[PDB]
Design a protein around this ligand. Structure first.
Ligand code: MG
Ligand code: MG
Ligand code: MG
Ligand code: MG
Ligand code: MG
Ligand code: MG
Ligand code: MG
Ligand code: MG
Ligand code: MG
Lengths: 43, 236, 125, 225, 125, 128
RNA sequence: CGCGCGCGCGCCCGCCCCCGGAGCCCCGCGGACGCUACGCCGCGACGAGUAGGAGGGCCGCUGCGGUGA
RNA sequence: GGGGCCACGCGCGCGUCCCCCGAAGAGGGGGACGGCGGAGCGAGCGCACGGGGUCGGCGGCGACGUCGGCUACCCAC
């Protein structure tokens, strides 16, 4: 639960944590605009 | 002094890594290889006889206690009240109408102006209608309704602060003996400056209110509960 | 020797007091008046003690002479000093520190002195 | 001649800041390697069966290497033979747990104390949640919490194990130095299952908890921890 | 609950000498410090034997000492005992020795010093 | 006014009542002082519900506050001025209490001096 | 192995007092507010109980020797 | 000119080796690695805070029939 007490031990997890956020946001973006494209193509 | 070149992504993490920040702030092309009790220090003086004199600052104690108390250990993030972060519930926005439910002006419907730098809210249930002036109120001893108006165009003065809505009592010059000690007029009396402030605001609040029909009776009435009115069911 | 005197005098002594889960000692020249090796006047080749003046003004200081022991009549030196409570503490502080006379008793002396001078005034109006 | 000494101490601090910066860089990189390791070992299984389902064959995957073991019955009315086997596995109290490696010797023991335990074939997430949260060390015959890597290395670095991840590697992949890593750990002290159990007096074919509940052990760990 | 046993969780060694002989106890104050503050085990052993009782500290005879120190290598080296030294009148040729002990008999004392020997205590050790 | 002690931590007492002996409500030869029961068929010993409770060491009190009065002070008993002057330095942790056998004409003296040295007295107005 | 590696001051060459007190968490000059060493402090694990065995009792009753000016 | 690297200081080498200009080796770019020269250099502030167990550099009301008082007298449940 605590960021620092995790990472005092394992520093690499700050990178693994920074990743897996930017990836999600990027993946969120694609679905939404693309699903919007077809929907606007429906009507 | 440049504002921070590392943006924020989540609290405690940034969007960039070490190698990239290095390049941004250019740590290349910025390499800095930079590599007998006689002395009477502070006290000084001058006076008449025998020559001059050397007066000594921060003199020593007279009286020592018989027993003292040790120090504390150290801690991280125990800020004081003048440094906290202020929050606010989401359903409260400038112009909203709010039900007071604790005090003397209890169960009345009022209007919200803004939030100060202490977490307390500024309220004017306009004195003509509700008999309720500029006051401070707490965001948690109140309900927000879903009933709103547009207030953006309005002039609230600068001088209106937590330092202005302060109580003033507890006067030490007293006999300290008798049937006394809340007797310096015993009472509260109104300045004119408050009056001036209430007038100058409600002058430009009130016309907007009358742009909504029936919005006055809602602001002269009083809220209460009765038979068959369970509050978790009713939306506000 | 000191420990030898001590290992007899822990528990059996006329100046000893043991009641109410507390333990005190009343020998003359005992700062903090507790039953201890560090605080006891009768045991060491060097000791300091502090008392009130008999006339009723100032503090009496007591130091041991180190040369002729086993003849207690002329083993103790005394001074009485009466000044403004900042000169009085400073004088004491200078004795001990600058002569290295049993310097683990410095502030204990001072606290005992101030207590006396605080009492040795019109504590009542 | 004081300045010579001052400079001597101020130098000698270099010996400690540089070492620490090195070691913290070391720990970083190994974990980055282990990341790549675990992926390959996951995807590799899949790649095989797809390559085999394309033909008409099958794929018999490997058998598991380690097991997790919980005790569920108490200490009251128990047999001598069984009281022994449990206290070799260090389960001297209810809802404690230990890892263990698997072979003909171990498995027959588990058949003997089958009705009193519940064991399974765990995954990686469960190993993480156990060790970080509820995971402590045995040191000088005392029980001390894993707050920093000084403790681990000082007692266990002669095996090439200097941090948490090195254990987890040594545990999850049952390594050459498993015995020492486990016996360093104190047996885990867990809380009772949030949500409830069906019936502890029976096997996990008749609606009970006992015996082997191979992959479903992880579902349970989520609720004990 | 926890299925363990408490029959063997107290140990039945000594922690201090059961006597009030005060000279003994000062020795014990000393060797605790040396055992606590040194990297040796000689200190440990001695501390353990000053607690022991008297049937666990039998007397050593002047005869055995000579046989055990006339052996090769044990030339110029001190002999150390945690009890008493007696005399053995069945021995005529008493050579030079450097003994340390608690007690030493009187006849034994004389002969040892008359060969040019020497007697020590644990303090001077 | 009243002499403040040095510290004033809150005090907590795990049990507040006393422990009465068993079968003392029936009878008058039997007293309120605790004597432990030792019979075979007895149920305080065997610890049934709804019965007398026996004192163990878990009711034991914290050590920072043990023999500590409600006022923060701990107590000490005297008979004359001579044994009062030993409290001069512990004048913020411990207090004084004068015995029951002292005469009126001497209590006045002791109080008059304790007030000087700032040594609180937990019974300054008794005989008069 | 880049939080020192040769830093500073006079004029490479030299100085290189330095805590009877440096400067903040190691000072190899001496010391705890703790040091009744039969003392003070810190960690970690445990606590059912008849007959019965041991220990601690500043829990108590009557008298002797010393001692509480 | 894609997103990403606890990459790094550059000056001539300390090296096993290699893609290539080049014959296996030297000289040139660097890379994989060890790493440390023929370079590697180091002060002053602050957020500290998801860092070695909580603080408020935040407040209000109340007074000759009222305030407090487990424990200890009675009664009820
Ligand atoms: Mg059963
Ligand atoms: Mg529930
Ligand atoms: Mg059920
Ligand atoms: Mg059954
Ligand atoms: Mg038992
Ligand atoms: Mg036993
Ligand atoms: Mg009680
Ligand atoms: Mg029975
Ligand atoms: Mg028991």
């Amino acid at each position: 639960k605590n960021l620092r007490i995790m990472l005092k031990l394992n520093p690499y997890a700050k990178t693994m944590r920074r990743n897996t956020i930017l990836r999600q946001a990027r993946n969120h973006k694609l679905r939404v605009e693309r699903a919007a494209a077809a929907l606007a193509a429906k009507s | 002094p440049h504002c921070s070149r590392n943006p924020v992504l989540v609290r405690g993490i940034g969007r960039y890594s070490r190698s990239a920040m290095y390049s941004r702030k250019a740590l290349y092309k910025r390499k800095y290889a930079a590599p007998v009790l006689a002395t009477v220090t502070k006290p000084v003086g001058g006076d008449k006889n025998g020559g001059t004199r050397v007066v000594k600052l921060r003199k020593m104690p007279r009286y020592y206690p018989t027993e003292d108390v040790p120090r504390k250990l150290l801690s991280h993030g125990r800020k004081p009240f003048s440094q906290h972060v202020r929050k606010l519930r989401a359903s409260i926005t400038p112009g909203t109408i709010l039900i007071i439910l604790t005090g003397r002006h209890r169960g009345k419907r009022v209007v919200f102006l803004k939030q100060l730098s202490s977490g307390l809210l500024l309220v004017t249930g306009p004195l003509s209608l509700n008999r309720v002036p500029l006051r401070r109120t707490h965001q948690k001893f109140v309900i927000a309704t879903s009933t709103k108006i547009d207030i953006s165009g309005v002039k609230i003065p600068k001088h209106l602060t937590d330092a202005y809505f302060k109580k003033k009592q507890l006067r030490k010059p007293r006999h300290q003996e008798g049937e006394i000690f809340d007797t310096e007029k015993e009472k509260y009396e109104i300045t004119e400056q408050r009056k001036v402030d209430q007038k100058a605001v409600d002058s430009q609040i009130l016309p907007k209110i009358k742009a909504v029909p029936q919005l006055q009776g809602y602001l002269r009435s009083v809220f209460a509960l009765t038979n068959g009115v369970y509050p978790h069911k009713l939306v506000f | 020797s000191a420990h030898l005197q001590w290992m007899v005098v822990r528990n059996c002594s006329s100046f000893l007091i043991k009641r109410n889960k507390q333990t005190y000692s009343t020998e003359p020249n005992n700062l903090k008046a507790r039953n201890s090796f560090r605080y006891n006047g009768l045991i060491h080749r060097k000791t300091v003690g502090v008392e009130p003046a008999a006339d009723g003004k100032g503090v009496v200081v007591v130091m041991k002479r180190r040369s002729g022991q086993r003849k207690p009549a002329t083993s103790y030196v005394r001074t009485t000093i009466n000044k403004n409570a900042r000169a009085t503490l400073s004088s004491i502080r200078h004795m001990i520190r600058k002569n290295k006379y049993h310097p683990d008793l410095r502030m204990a002396a001072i606290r005992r002195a101030s207590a006396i001078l605080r009492s040795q005034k019109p504590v009542m109006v | 001649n004081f300045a010579e000494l001052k400079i001597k101490r101020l130098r000698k601090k270099f010996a400690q800041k540089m070492l620490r910066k090195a070691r913290r860089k070391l720990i970083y990189e190994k974990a980055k390697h282990y990341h790549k390791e675990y992926r390959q070992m996951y995807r590799t299984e899949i790649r095989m069966a797809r390559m085999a389902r394309k033909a008409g064959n099958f794929y018999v995957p490997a058998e598991p290497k380690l097991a997790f073991v919980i005790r569920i019955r108490g200490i009251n009315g128990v047999s001598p033979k069984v009281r022994k086997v449990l206290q070799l596995l260090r389960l001297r109290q209810i809802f404690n747990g230990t890892f263990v490696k698997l072979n003909k010797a171990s498995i027959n023991m588990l058949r003997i104390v089958e009705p009193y335990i519940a064991w399974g074939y765990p995954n990686l997430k469960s190993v993480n949640e156990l060790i970080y949260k509820r995971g402590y060390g045995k040191i000088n015959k005392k029980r001390i919490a894993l707050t920093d890597n000084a403790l681990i290395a000082r007692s266990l670095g002669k095996y090439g194990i200097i941090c948490m991840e090195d254990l987890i590697h040594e545990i999850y992949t049952v390594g050459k130095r498993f015995k020492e890593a486990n016996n360093f750990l104190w047996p885990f002290k867990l809380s009772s299952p949030r949500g409830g159990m069906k019936k502890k007096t029976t096997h996990f074919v008749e609606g009970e908890d006992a015996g082997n509940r191979e992959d479903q052990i992880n579902r349970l760990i989520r609720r004990m921890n | 609950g926890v299925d363990i046993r408490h029959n063997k969780d107290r140990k039945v060694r000594r922690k201090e000498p059961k006597s009030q002989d005060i000279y003994l106890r000062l020795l014990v104050k000393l060797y605790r410090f040396l055992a606590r503050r040194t990297n040796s085990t000689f200190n440990q052993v001695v501390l353990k034997r000053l607690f022991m009782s008297r049937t666990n500290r039998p007397p050593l005879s002047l005869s055995r000492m000579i046989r055990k120190m006339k052996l090769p290598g044990r030339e110029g080296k001190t002999a150390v005992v945690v009890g008493t030294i007696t005399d053995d009148v069945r021995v005529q040729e008493v050579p030079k020795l450097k003994v340390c002990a608690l007690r030493v008999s009187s006849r034994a004392r004389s002969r040892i010093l008359k060969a040019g020997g020497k007697i020590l205590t644990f303090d001077q050790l | 006014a009243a002499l403040r002690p040095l510290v004033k931590p809150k005090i907590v007492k795990k049990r507040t009542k006393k422990f009465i002996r068993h079968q003392s409500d029936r009878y008058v030869k039997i007293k309120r002082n605790w004597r432990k029961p030792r019979g075979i068929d007895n149920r305080v010993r065997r610890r049934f519900k709804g019965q007398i409770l026996m004192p163990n060491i878990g009711y034991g009190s914290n050590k920072k506050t043990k023999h500590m009065l409600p006022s923060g002070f701990r107590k000490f008993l005297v008979h004359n001025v001579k044994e009062l002057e030993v409290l001069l330095m512990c004048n913020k942790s411990y207090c004084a209490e004068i015995a029951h056998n002292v005469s009126s004409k001497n209590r006045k003296a002791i109080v008059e001096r304790a007030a000087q040295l700032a040594i609180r007295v937990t019974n300054p107005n008794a005989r008069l």
